Amino acid sequence: DKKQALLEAATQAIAQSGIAASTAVIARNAGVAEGTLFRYFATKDELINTLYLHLTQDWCQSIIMELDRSITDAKMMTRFLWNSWISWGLNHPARHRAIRQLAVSEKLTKETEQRADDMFPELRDHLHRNVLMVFMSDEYRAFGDGLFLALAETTMDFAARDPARAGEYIALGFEAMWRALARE
Amino acid sequence: DKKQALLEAATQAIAQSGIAASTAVIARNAGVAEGTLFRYFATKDELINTLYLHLTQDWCQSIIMELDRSITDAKMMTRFLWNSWISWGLNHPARHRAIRQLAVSEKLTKETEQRADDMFPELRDHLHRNVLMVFMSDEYRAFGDGLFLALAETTMDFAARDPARAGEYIALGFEAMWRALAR
Ligand SMILES: COc1cc2c(cc1OC)-c1c(OC)c(OC)cc3c1[C@H](C2)N(C)CC3
Numbered sequence: 452d453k454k455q456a457l458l459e460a461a462t463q464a465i466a467q468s469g470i471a472a473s474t475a476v477i478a479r480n481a482g483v484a485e486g487t488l489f490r491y492f493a494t495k496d497e498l499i500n501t502l503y504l505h506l507t508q509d510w511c512q513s514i515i516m517e518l519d520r521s522i523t524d525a526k527m528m529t530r531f532l533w534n535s536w537i538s539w540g541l542n543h544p545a546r547h548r549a550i551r552q553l554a555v556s557e558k559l560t561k562e563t564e565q566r567a568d569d570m571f572p573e574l575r576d577h578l579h580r581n582v583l584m585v586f587m588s589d590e591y592r593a594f595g596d597g598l599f600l601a602l603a604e605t606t607m608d609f610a611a612r613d614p615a616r617a618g619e620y621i622a623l624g625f626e627a628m629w630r631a632l633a634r635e
Numbered sequence: 636d637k638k639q640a641l642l643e644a645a646t647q648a649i650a651q652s653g654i655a656a657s658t659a660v661i662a663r664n665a666g667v668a669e670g671t672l673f674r675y676f677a678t679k680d681e682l683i684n685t686l687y688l689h690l691t692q693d694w695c696q697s698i699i700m701e702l703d704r705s706i707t708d709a710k711m712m713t714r715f716l717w718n719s720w721i722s723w724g725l726n727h728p729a730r731h732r733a734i735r736q737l738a739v740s741e742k743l744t745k746e747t748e749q750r751a752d753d754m755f756p757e758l759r760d761h762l763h764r765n766v767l768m769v770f771m772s773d774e775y776r777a778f779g780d781g782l783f784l785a786l787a788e789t790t791m792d793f794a795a796r797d798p799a800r801a802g803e804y805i806a807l808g809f810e811a812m813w814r815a816l817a818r
């Protein structure tokens with residue numbers, strides 16, 4: 452599928468260069484021309500919105516596939532979701548780097564933000580109950596996501612480069628994130 | 636001059652391509668051959684180290700300048716330090732982009748690390764008194780550094796794009812960092 456080829460190529464390019472990644476590079480790496488890229492995505496912004504939804508679906512399905520239903524404590528459930536997030540990023544570091552660039556972008560439309568939330572409603576509701584009010588507000592929700600993604604990517608980076616201590620980085624990063632973002 | 640032209644060209648190149656920026660491009664952006672860069676610097680690792688101290692001195696000076704330690708409260712002093720760091724990164728995005736990568740680059744020697752600490756000894760003392768002891772340990776200080784830098788860089792990024800709310804981002808970033816890292 453050439454649409455999937457373009458999305459995979461856009462993941463790799465945006466992980467490397469951010470949203471500044473060139474659509475000519477992306478198309479060529481997908482094995483297609485820049486013109487047919489724009490026949491799939493009429494604008495670069497449309498490519499960016501669709502890719503963010505594609506990657507959001509990917510990590511949502513992966514984390515839904517691991518959801519431990521025994522966990523009934525709110526902080527332990529958040530630790531499990533954090534662990535699942537770090538694992539996804541360690542397993543797919545390009546996807547995580549790309550999604551971190553996309554999530555903190557002003558190019559995401561309101562329909563995209565709504566569709567991203569609806570892909571994992573149990574998680575959206577869980578965060579509404581446990582995250583500090585300011586980081587669910589209309590004005591500071593994206594910044595709260597940016598702070599989460601920054602602590603998570605740092606945690607992945609140190610876990611990946613020093614795997615003998617990966618569990619420690621992940622638990623220290625979790626505890627740091629929990630008091631940065633969560634209701635005490 | 637020639638050493639500084641290499642240092643500033645290395646700052647722009649490492650900001651644009653990361654620490655793996657080629658010595659040829661850096662040398663070329665200063666009008667000198669690649670072999671002259673290896674004359675001024677023994678290895679790439681050594682130039683990475685030297686650039687780190689040059690950029691560390693640049694922000695330490697900028698922060699010691701606005702440093703008022705007539706303030707006694709630990710939290711409010713950390714807030715003003717945080718604000719100065721954000722201010723420096725906003726004013727010099729390329730210098731901050733370069734230093735942020737070197738700080739987590741794992742190629743910095745420990746003479747370099749301690750020489751960086753000596754450029755601002757009161758900050759090191761303030762940090763030891765107020766940062767969670769796990770993050771001031773030798774095992775996890777780099778990680779604690781990385782977390783601080785990631786939070787601060789996100790704060791800078793939102794403040795730059797949204798100047799009307801910039802200080803709110805700065806205030807919220809500080810409070811999250813403070814909860815994440817301080818005792
Ligand atoms: C502002 O606070 C928070 C914001 C978010 C998350 C957690 C927070 O604090 C617990 C969070 C999360 O939850 C662990 C999780 O789990 C799979 C996944 C993700 C996120 C963030 C948004 N983004 C949606 C990337 C994916």
Ligand SMILES: COc1cc2c(cc1OC)-c1c(OC)c(OC)cc3c1[C@H](C2)N(C)CC3
Nearest residue numbers: 698713716717720766770779780783816817
């Ligand atoms: C692990 O905890 C911390 C680590 C650091 C800082 C603060 C921390 O907690 C408050 C910190 C700081 O202090 C505000 C500051 O101010 C001029 C400047 C800087 C840093 C970090 C290291 N790096 C040295 C970049 C520069």
